[PDB]
Design a protein around this ligand. Structure first.
Ligand SMILES: Nc1ncnc2c1ncn2[C@@H]1O[C@H](COP(=O)(O)OP(=O)(O)NP(=O)(O)O)[C@@H](O)[C@H]1O
Ligand SMILES: Nc1ncnc2c1ncn2[C@@H]1O[C@H](COP(=O)(O)OP(=O)(O)NP(=O)(O)O)[C@@H](O)[C@H]1O
Ligand SMILES: O=C(C[C@@H]1CCCCN1)Cn1cnc2cc(Cl)c(F)cc2c1=O
Ligand SMILES: O=C(C[C@@H]1CCCCN1)Cn1cnc2cc(Cl)c(F)cc2c1=O
Ligand SMILES: [Mg+2]
Ligand SMILES: [Mg+2]
Ligand SMILES: [Mg+2]
Ligand SMILES: [Mg+2]
Lengths: 562, 562
């Protein structure tokens, strides 16, 4: 393509709104444009990168016999009522009515839709297993869209769904997808790690998140240097090995604590270490209010709470609810269940809130002053603590969730009545797997890991064009004519972006750095001599090359790119 | 792909609901599945055909420097308010609210969205022209979804938009698109014709519809055998050359006409020819009621009415409105404007309704009994009539509108303030073109023209697989082992669908006819001898071939397919 015919609205200055480097760079390089909050258009160069990503995805899917389909965004509410998800989800599910008052969801995902395709069509065990996937735009009314393509409200997902006669078949396809995903991410230029993920409040089947290792990552991975242990910090179990810090039991005193809000402020006010303070939060779980206690150096992990209680309906109590009910503390007259993290047992003579502003309690002891109804693992692991598998020490790394693989089992097939006749000839619900890659999120993740201060540095596998051909001054006949000839010579074997614009060299080069193609061929002053400059985007190395050498010099350099 | 791993839910019996052969065949062959009215899922084989179609489209777009983008389905209402289309369109525009009460449209098309991308980015004449396209799913709440993919509510369109400094530039890109479209349709196996289309009520710029010539087609093309004249019957002008049929003027009589509703019934009741009767319809146009008169052998063309009056707000009057106001006729006491088709002037002594059930008027004469306020071309041309260009006689052919090219001009750029600095350095609105192909409709059109009674007969260019490899009985080691070997040999150069199923030959062959791959390789009883049968889907020709000959026999046959 001639660059004069390609829409690439490069920016001079990026807004301070934009925080993530991928978002800033995708804006600055003219690759995306925001329509409104979390809704973007993919401009020409981004679309070419998307096409390269999806081609790779399609190859890896076909390699494991995952077969492409395309399902609708408009999904009738009756389908979501069959599964029970219509009522289970709130404002994140985008909903609408058609001209006859019939209700629809815009698809956030397609479990019901695919199940509706397959039911009474996958009739026999002889047709199983079956794996289907699409690359399609999903809709989720995210509470907080942010970081550009990392969290949009309309986004591209590759979603796959597999159907099985038994657990062993599912296990096989799960493994195939796991391995395919690893290959996908490596091929597109992402350093990713699969990590054990939380299976939800109610379920317990296996699931792995694929995490692009990057500092902007909102997820934390817990990993071993000794074993292959890798878990999301939400999931990572803390094993409690008793190590008591008990001192001689003292009597309960209420004390004045002016302007003290936080646990660390309290610690500093009392001259005690923060770990000796116990914090109290109030949660509402399936209707009823509870107390959860953790040590001052720890934080409550509400994914663990959800899994512990076996419910998703867990939220913190509001200011009003806390007032109506009751710095908070566990010494209260009301009949309320009190839960404590296991590591609270290493202390006695607790420091807690008084349920009375300006006051805290000291020397509070369990059994005497209040009772803990149940102990458990309700917190995040800390870096340095012993891992649950006994392998060694916990290390953290940040991560972007670029994909996930799930064993679903029979949830949808039982609720929506999707059965097959087994080996014995009796009706059984389809065993399902499901697997997803954030395609637009992955595009951003590629950028996060493949850039410098001057712009994007696209991997060879996904770069929108292979070579940037640049004439310094096309008013000069020798430059223009040479560059024209080179375009013709190179644009058969390669995809060439030819910067043919009547535009100052400075802006062409600036644009070229932002766009980030791996190799640059500059035609300038030495065009008469048949000499051009070849520049590498990654290293910034530059060398002069005569045109008769150019095909082999470029071919060799291209072949040796990562 | 092994067919055991591909979801292809072939049917025994198609519902009587399904009317169009493409719809019936796409259902029966396991290519689409209806989710709800006008909303389909594309199953594996259809998705492969879609991918082949879009690849061809992408090549032809790149050939004319049309550059791919991807714009969102969710479009904020504020954008549609800028253009005025939010208020101009009714229930066909699908609308919704997000979780903060902000209003959106699901995109039925993207004029506003693309204009919002380009505005203040295409800043100078030096950047023009620019052409952008996407392949993306559109949403229209069609009053009457029908004929499967021919009229859905969610459908795939390729939509392109071009931006220009002057009319000559637009004319150039319009021509490029016109030519590209012709190539696209020929390559995908469609016999199509470009035809002059109606430019809307208000506009007068050029537009051509691309019509797939097929009997299920709801459009009628008017064409010359002498010239290149081709117009949609909605557009095709009728030139009135006077040819009076006048008889001696007679006095107005009201007559009894029991059980006579239609013009033909009236003609038969009176023993007169139907062309001597004049029909009267009441229309509401921009608020006010009018009468339109046509001869009994003619029909009112309300696209012509819309163009004549320069408004889209034209509808027939309801039963109540007709009652409140007034077989209908033009002899009425009320002050109402009466319009007549030009060919009414060839008659005198008109036969009309009486505005009184059970009665009609005879010997009604213009000037005496009522006045015609204006004469015009308000009807459809008939087959046999002289064409507007004087080239010769009108012939009809049926057609499916598979695409359209439009000159838009400055409608959106003026309403949405999208300007560029011209040669003189002064702000001017962008001159726009827009161009669309119904991708999913085209898929159906391919089927309509490429099938027989036993199933689909896919053109080589779009067939989901190239060769159907079929083992008659895979329990036989020699058949299975031979077919396995052939799969490996052929599935590098070709895409092979390998029917490896444990399934009776009869159903394999039936399935194979429905699926419609151009060449079939059958491995059966003569597998031990290294002999297979090669069968052509189009002709039904069959011949025996030894395996050492097979690569060249298949390659030659494949190369000689259309
Ligand atoms: N709002 C979004 N924008 C872009 N990509 C997304 C979004 N939500 C999910 N994805 C991607 O789609 C994949 C599968 O979706 P899913 O597992 O439902 O995401 P999720 O668990 O809701 N992730 P998150 O919302 O980031 O906690 C994820 O691994 C992401 O890569
Ligand atoms: N409801 C639909 N289902 C499938 N394809 C469609 C539909 N509407 C339009 N298309 C296709 O999209 C192309 C461009 O859209 P457009 O010109 O807006 O269609 P349109 O004039 O509304 N056609 P119609 O509704 O059939 O009179 C058309 O040429 C069709 O091929
Ligand atoms: O979508 C998944 C899991 C996998 C991911 C890969 C493809 C198959 N699905 C999980 N999830 C997340 N957010 C959701 C949001 C809404 Cl509004 C919803 F209604 C449903 C879901 C929902 O189910
Ligand atoms: O879409 C087009 C014309 C071209 C076709 C090719 C791509 C660019 N657009 C015409 N049209 C048709 N039906 C519509 C329906 C609704 Cl609900 C709407 F709001 C708008 C339109 C509308 O504008
Ligand atoms: Mg989410
Ligand atoms: Mg997830
Ligand atoms: Mg329409
Ligand atoms: Mg049209």
């Amino acid at each position: 393509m001639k660059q004069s015919k390609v829409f690439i609205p490069t920016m001079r200055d990026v807004p301070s709104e934009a925080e993530a480097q991928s978002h800033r760079l995708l804006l600055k390089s003219g690759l995306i444009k925001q329509s409104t909050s979390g809704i973007y258009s993919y401009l020409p160069l981004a679309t070419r990168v998307l096409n390269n990503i999806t081609a790779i995805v399609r190859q890896e899917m076909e390699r494991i016999d995952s077969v492409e389909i395309l399902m609708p965004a408009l999904q009738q509410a009756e389908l979501w009522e069959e599964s029970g998800r219509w009522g289970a989800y709130g404002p994140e599910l985008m909903r609408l009515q058609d001209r006859h008052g019939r209700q629809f969801a815009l698809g956030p995902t397609h479990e019901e839709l695919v199940t509706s395709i397959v039911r009474n069509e996958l009739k026999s065990y002889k047709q199983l297993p079956m794996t289907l996937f699409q690359i399609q735009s999903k809709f989720r009314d995210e509470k907080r869209p942010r970081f550009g393509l990392l969290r949009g409200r309309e986004f591209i997902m590759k979603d796959a769904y597999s159907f099985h006669a038994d657990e062993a078949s599912l296990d096989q396809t799960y493994q195939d997808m796991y391995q395919a995903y690893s290959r996908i991410f490596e091929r597109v230029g992402i350093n990713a790690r699969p990590v054990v993920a939380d299976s939800g409040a109610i379920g317990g089947s296996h699931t792995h998140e694929f995490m692009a290792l990057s500092a902007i990552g909102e997820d934390t991975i817990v990993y071993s240097k000794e074993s292959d242990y890798t878990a999301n910090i939400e999931k990572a179990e803390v094993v409690y090995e008793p190590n008591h810090k008990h001192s001689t039991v003292q009597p309960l005193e209420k004390i004045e604590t002016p302007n003290v809000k936080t646990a660390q402020e309290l610690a500093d006010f009392l001259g005690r270490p923060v770990d000796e303070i116990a914090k109290t939060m109030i949660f509402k779980v399936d209707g009823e209010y509870i107390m959860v206690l953790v040590r001052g150096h720890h934080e409550i992990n509400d994914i663990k709470l959800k899994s512990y209680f076996g419910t998703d309906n867990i939220e913190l109590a509001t200011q009003d609810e806390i007032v109506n009910l009751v710095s908070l503390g566990p010494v209260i007259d009301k009949e309320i269940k009190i839960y404590a993290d296991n590591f609270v047992q290493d202390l006695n003579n607790l420091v807690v809130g008084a349920n009375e502003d300006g006051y805290h309690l000291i020397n509070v002891n369990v059994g005497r002053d209040f009772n803990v109804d149940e102990y458990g693992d309700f917190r995040f692991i800390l870096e340095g603590e012993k891992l649950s598998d006994g392998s060694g020490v916990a290390h953290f790394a940040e991560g972007i969730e670029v994909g996930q693989v799930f064993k679903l089992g029979t949830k949808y097939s039982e609720s929506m009545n999707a059965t097959f006749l087994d080996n014995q000839g009796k009706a059984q619900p389809l065993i399902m797997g499901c697997y997803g890659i954030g395609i637009s999120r992955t595009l951003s993740a590629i950028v996060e890991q493949n850039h410098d201060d001057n712009g994007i540095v696209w991997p060879k596998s996904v770069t929108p064009f292979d070579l940037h051909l640049i004439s310094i001054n096309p008013k000069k006949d020798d430059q223009r004519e040479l560059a024209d000839a080179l375009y013709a010579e190179f644009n058969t074997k390669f995809d060439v972006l030819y910067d043919d614009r009547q535009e100052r060299a400075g802006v062409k080069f600036n644009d070229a750095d932002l766009i980030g193609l791996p190799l640059r061929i500059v035609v300038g002053k030495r065009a008469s001599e048949g000499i051009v400059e070849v520049k590498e985007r990654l290293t910034g190395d530059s060398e002069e090359v005569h045109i008769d050498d150019l095909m082999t010099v470029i071919t060799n350099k291209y072949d040796n790119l990562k």
